[PDB]
Design a protein around this ligand. Sequence first.
Ligand SMILES: Cc1nc2ccccn2c1C(=O)Nc1c(C)[nH]c(/C=C2\C(=O)N=C3CC=C(C(=O)N[C@H](C)c4ccc(F)cc4)C=C32)c1C
Length: 503
Amino acid sequence: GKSKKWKEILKFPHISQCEDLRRTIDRDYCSLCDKQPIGRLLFRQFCETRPGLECYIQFLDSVAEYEVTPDEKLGEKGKEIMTKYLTPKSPVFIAQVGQDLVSQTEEKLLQKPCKELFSACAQSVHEYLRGEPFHEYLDSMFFDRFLQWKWLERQPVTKNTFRQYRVLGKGGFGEVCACQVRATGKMYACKRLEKKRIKKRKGESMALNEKQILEKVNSQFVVNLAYAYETKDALCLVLTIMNGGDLKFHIYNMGNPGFEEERALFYAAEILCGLEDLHRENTVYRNLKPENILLDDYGHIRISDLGLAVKIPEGDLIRGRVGTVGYMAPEVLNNQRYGLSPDYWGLGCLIYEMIEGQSPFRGRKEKVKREEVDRRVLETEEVYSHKFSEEAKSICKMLLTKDAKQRLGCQEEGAAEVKRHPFFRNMNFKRLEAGMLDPPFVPDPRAVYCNLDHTDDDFYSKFSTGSVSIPWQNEMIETECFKELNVFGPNGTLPPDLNRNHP
Ligand SMILES: Cc1nc2ccccn2c1C(=O)Nc1c(C)[nH]c(/C=C2\C(=O)N=C3CC=C(C(=O)N[C@H](C)c4ccc(F)cc4)C=C32)c1C
């Protein structure tokens, strides 16, 4: 349901309006052709025109399909690619991957199959595209079209850019509504942080820390920031919408309480990928509890409440003693200097709670005081039941190691060490990260699951940076606004908006 005049809101500017953009955007190949969705599509579209580049795009697509292929169907897919791209007499031949690597790839086909068989060829193809093809695309009309899309991206976001529907939750500094972008009709989750209370509580820095952390990470399994704007009475964070409920509700109201080990495996695998994406930024979450894991319309999960996340400088440690009683790692309860370890402790808490239907250190049917709960966390070894396989027991007690130094995932390897644990032995993380594995529970669509200081002005400005680049471009693509507006001249000619004559 896009606005009636949406083709006028997202109307392309004349290319003459984008010269300031042309000369400031860093001409980085990975950024302009891969990281940014619309740039990636436009570069691929450019390669579609030249006959020599089309084959390389098709090959990369087939390698992307190969890496997520089922294990027992690997050799079948690999040989196909070989007969189509790596054969010298093929109509679609990869010429820049010389024979000195075609032969190596054929040796691996003569041997076992690995999901990274075509990694060498794919990187060689990329090493070729970053050269002449990329610099030709920079002087092509498709990069001028990309500049037009960036011009729209940088436009100012106001309250009139969205329309709010209903209030879906309350919090500490404000509330959470459900807004929609009028021009594209995409739903979001508005997070109103009301100004008066931020300045009274002197928690300005925390709002910027959460906003910056949210706009940085671009994970499939953490709520993403799409817009950060300001109104006459609040600061708004437009985040991913999650209508599927929260994991606490499904553990206790929908559960046994608890899930089957396989169901918990799926949710744990997605939470681990979320924590991994966060730790790629040396950002620790510290707020892992079942109610913070939200489900979407499809059944997948994301980590939601980033109000307690902070970015650890590389090589640094921090102090805190923050979180929720029962989900605080011993190093946090002791108020020590820690790194990312609280999140792996939380992952242990989550896996245990999903399988067993209660926290590892307090019973569902137990009336205990915070003092005793903490004492158990610091001194008591959790017990396990027949609901846990041996692998499930293993990963849980390894993640629940009191000594953050010996805790799983807290080595130089990081989340890698966790993905390798035998508890995920039957989990294909490549397919999971690609959204290829079916979630174990799909929420029903219709379901309902539940002043003049001027220093404030400077704070206003650094917060409200506007639309976030990758989420914005993805929004454009999903709502099909890109497919509709991204039209050129008939038969490869220039459209009027891209011709510097007759502006
Ligand atoms: C299915 C259904 N039926 C009913 C019936 C009645 C009521 C609800 N529902 C739902 C339901 O799930 N609603 C819902 C939807 C769609 N999204 C969310 C929340 C989020 C979302 O999507 N993305 C983030 C990111 C980050 C947060 C987050 O940090 N929150 C904390 C506490 C917070 C801190 C400070 C604040 F000022 C405000 C909040 C929350 C969210 C909720 C709660």
